[PDB]
Write a protein that binds this ligand. Structure first.
Ligand SMILES: [Li+]
Length: 188
């Protein structure tokens, strides 16, 4: 009953009993993934989170937590597909859990600039962010086919799907990401 579902991508795997759970690192007292979720909720009514570890902790703020399928596909596309398989509705705006400053016109600008493409993603003037992406339902079968073929590459898929980058170079620093605890410490 809303047009785009927001999705925080809080990682998959735990390919050695985890290591740092990046989405749960706290920035000014608030988990990174919750900064992203709050920024999506500014612009969208329905927001969910894809998380595969510490699910009870992710569930604490009252959002639906979606876990990856048993297929255990590699990389960020696996979480995208698991979310499309477990949520109805025609459009999704994905964003990783480590980019806490995403802007309140993310959804609106990606939608304005979609120009008939089934997928668009953010370019920040320096680099593509192909996991910050507005994706139509139609992508679901293509994603399933690509991951079943054993592929993982995100940009390659976005290209195969007929997507394009949307220019957010004027949004100074809204797309900085926290790569490590070492980096997080600097933004406090
Ligand atoms: Li642990």
């Amino acid at each position: 009953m809303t047009t785009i579902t927001g999705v925080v991508l809080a990682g998959g795997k735990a390919r050695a009993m985890g290591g740092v759970d990046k989405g749960l690192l706290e920035l000014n007292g608030k988990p990174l993934w919750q900064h992203v979720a709050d920024a999506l909720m500014t612009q969208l009514s329905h927001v969910v989170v894809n998380a595969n570890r510490h699910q009870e902790i992710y569930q604490a703020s009252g959002l639906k937590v979606i876990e990856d399928s048993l297929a255990d596909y590699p990389g960020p596309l696996a979480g995208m597909l698991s979310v499309m398989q477990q949520e109805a509705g025609e459009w999704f705006l994905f964003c990783p859990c480590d980019t806490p400053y995403i802007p309140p016109d993310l959804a609106a600008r990606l939608n304005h600039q979609r120009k008939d493409a089934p997928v668009v993603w953010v370019h920040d003037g320096e680099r593509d962010h192909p996991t910050i992406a507005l994706v139509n339902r139609a992508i679901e079968p293509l994603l399933l086919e690509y991951l079943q073929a054993g592929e993982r590459r995100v940009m390659v898929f976005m290209r195969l799907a007929g997507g394009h980058a949307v220019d957010f170079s004027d949004h100074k620093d809204a797309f900085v990401n926290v790569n490590t605890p070492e980096e997080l410490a600097r933004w406090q």
